[PDB]
Amino acid sequence: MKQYLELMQKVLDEGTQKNDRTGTGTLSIFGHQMRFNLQDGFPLVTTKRCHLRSIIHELLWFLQGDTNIAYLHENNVTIWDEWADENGDLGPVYGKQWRAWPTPDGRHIDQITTVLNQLKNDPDSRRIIVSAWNVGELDKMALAPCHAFFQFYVADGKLSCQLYQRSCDVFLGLPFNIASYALLVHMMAQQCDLEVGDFVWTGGDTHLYSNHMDQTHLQLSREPRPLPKLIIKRAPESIFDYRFEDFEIEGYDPHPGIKAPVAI
Amino acid sequence: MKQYLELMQKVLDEGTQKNDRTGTGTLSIFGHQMRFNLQDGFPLVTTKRCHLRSIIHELLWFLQGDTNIAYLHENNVTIWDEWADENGDLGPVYGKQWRAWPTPDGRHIDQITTVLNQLKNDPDSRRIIVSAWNVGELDKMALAPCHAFFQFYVADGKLSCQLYQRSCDVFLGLPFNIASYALLVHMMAQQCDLEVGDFVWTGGDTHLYSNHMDQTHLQLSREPRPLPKLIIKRAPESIFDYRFEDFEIEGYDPHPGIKAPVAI
Numbered sequence A, B: 001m002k003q004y005l006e007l008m009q010k011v012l013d014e015g016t017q018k019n020d021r022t023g024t025g026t027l028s029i030f031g032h033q034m035r036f037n038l039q040d041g042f043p044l045v046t047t048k049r050c051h052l053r054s055i056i057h058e059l060l061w062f063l064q065g066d067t068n069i070a071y072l073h074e075n076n077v078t079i080w081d082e083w084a085d086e087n088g089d090l091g092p093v094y095g096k097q098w099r100a101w102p103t104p105d106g107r108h109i110d111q112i113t114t115v116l117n118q119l120k121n122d123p124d125s126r127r128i129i130v131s132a133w134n135v136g137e138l139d140k141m142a143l144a145p146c147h148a149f150f151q152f153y154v155a156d157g158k159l160s161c162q163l164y165q166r167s168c169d170v171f172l173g174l175p176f177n178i179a180s181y182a183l184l185v186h187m188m189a190q191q192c193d194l195e196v197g198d199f200v201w202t203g204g205d206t207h208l209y210s211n212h213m214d215q216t217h218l219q220l221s222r223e224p225r226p227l228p229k230l231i232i233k234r235a236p237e238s239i240f241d242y243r244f245e246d247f248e249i250e251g252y253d254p255h256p257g258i259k260a261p262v263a264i
């Protein structure tokens, strides 16, 4: 896509060589913002072939409050294996924080149904937020949240969402992170009888790993194809009731897929 | 200031009419980003005289880990008066969360000490964050954090910071928060012997209150002047020890005044 490709060029043009914990080394920039009107089409990259199967399963799983990868395995999704323990646990990552953020006085807050009650009763608050950034449990998480915090907005009967990504693997992670939040926005908008608006991505440390420059120049030598279209074949009684098969992607004709190694 | 004036017009040009919680009405935009190179001058707005004693005390107030307006009144800062209770309390707002995030198991996490430690021992970290968005104690706050989450980044011996602002009063709050965060950056740079970098500002609900229309018009018609220079008279033995008297600004000759009411 237009936006992602210009971001990729920005990191190359303006990036600085930094060392990272994985020991790989990146080219990185700090702070970037991009916007996608979900009315133009579903933001799934076309310059490389993506797999919706795994984006959809990881999203169903977070909505479930699940943080053990077995579900992921039942479905042939291995994106998280590298970080699970012997039991398949990741610790209290995304799904846990989303659905049961632990308070100091022994409560758990379900952030997802709270955002849904606001959308329904005061679509105008300035506090329609879900955070995965639980400071108190960061130490128990297999990896700290990359997509850390997000806020919903309703203006002309359209639902928008701005995500704050503290850490971004531009090559492997981003295409996946954008496809995922876009699916979410469609999910919520369908629950609320609203139209989809814009998806705003905002980044912290936005980088390209060292072992990814070749794949980066190869991708960049390509012209984006028209954006795919998302179709939902049902309106479930709740956002927690969606099924993998309720979704169809129409008109996706991507350029060939490009392989790159994930960093540690 | 230029980026600052430019956002004021964007709001007038594209803002959506919203019914506010305060019941005041607003012109709003969702998702905005601006960047200030700290090497170019201290970002205090010049299109209106800004009063720095209150910017200074509020921040020293936050780093002390205080939620009582007592300290502030002793320094004549009246800013948080309409929100505190009868004991002068705000609940577990900013200062509290920076300094003593309460885990679910009794303990406290000192996010400013964790940050200083990181800047010193692991400057390449993609996790140098301070979050005031403790979902677990929102209920207990006089008002939910506006300036909600921030991240530090070290690149060529320079120190950058990105703030995520979920709600912004463009006329009244914006200039304040901008100076506040430009100020911490210099304090951390000094205490870490780093160069100042960029201060990146990202907001969510970015708005103009209906009763700030005259003040805005007035403002938009004045010419930005050159940015002051920030001077730190002494080098405290810790970020916990700065003081009103430690900071001097030179080169500031702002335009006269503008008085506007605050939204309750």
Ligand SMILES: C#CCN(Cc1ccc2[nH]c(N)nc(=O)c2c1)c1ccc(C(=O)N[C@@H](CCC(=O)O)C(=O)O)cc1
Binding pocket: A022, A050, A079, A080, A143, A169, A171, A172, A173, A174, A175, A176, A177, A260, A262, A263, A264
């Ligand atoms: C983000 C995210 C969710 N997740 C989690 C996840 C966990 C840790 C991370 N660590 C690093 N260094 N980069 C990440 O993007 C990353 C992503 C993913 C994990 C792996 C792949 C990956 O290997 N994928 C594809 C290639 C296609 C692509 O790069 O989309 C593959 O099938 O090889 C994608 C997403």
Ligand SMILES: C#CCN(Cc1ccc2[nH]c(N)nc(=O)c2c1)c1ccc(C(=O)N[C@@H](CCC(=O)O)C(=O)O)cc1
Binding pocket: B051, B054, B079, B080, B169, B172, B173, B174, B176, B177, B258, B259, B260, B262, B263, B264
């Ligand atoms: C953000 C923030 C911190 N705070 C907190 C704060 C809390 C609630 C809010 N409520 C609303 N509706 N808008 C805000 O900007 C706002 C700001 C501030 C509060 C008041 C002023 C203010 O009235 N300023 C005047 C004169 C103040 C003076 O005498 O110095 C001015 O034009 O500066 C500034 C900052």
Ligand SMILES: *c1cc(=O)[nH]c(=O)n1[C@H]1C[C@H](O)[C@@H](COP(=O)(O)O)O1
Binding pocket: A021, A022, A143, A144, A145, A146, A147, A167, A168, A169, A170, A173, A174, A177, B126, B127
């Ligand atoms: C995290 C997972 C995901 O959702 N998206 C991301 O891009 N990643 C990336 C960013 C970075 O390369 C890494 C995490 O490492 P760190 O916590 O920043 O050290 O995975």
Ligand SMILES: *c1cc(=O)[nH]c(=O)n1[C@H]1C[C@H](O)[C@@H](COP(=O)(O)O)O1
Binding pocket: A126, A127, B021, B143, B144, B145, B146, B147, B167, B168, B169, B170, B172, B173, B174, B177, B263
């Ligand atoms: C919050 C305080 C701050 O430091 N910055 C500000 O800009 N404000 C503002 C924004 C908004 O108008 C109001 C808070 O209201 P809400 O919680 O967003 O409804 O004060």
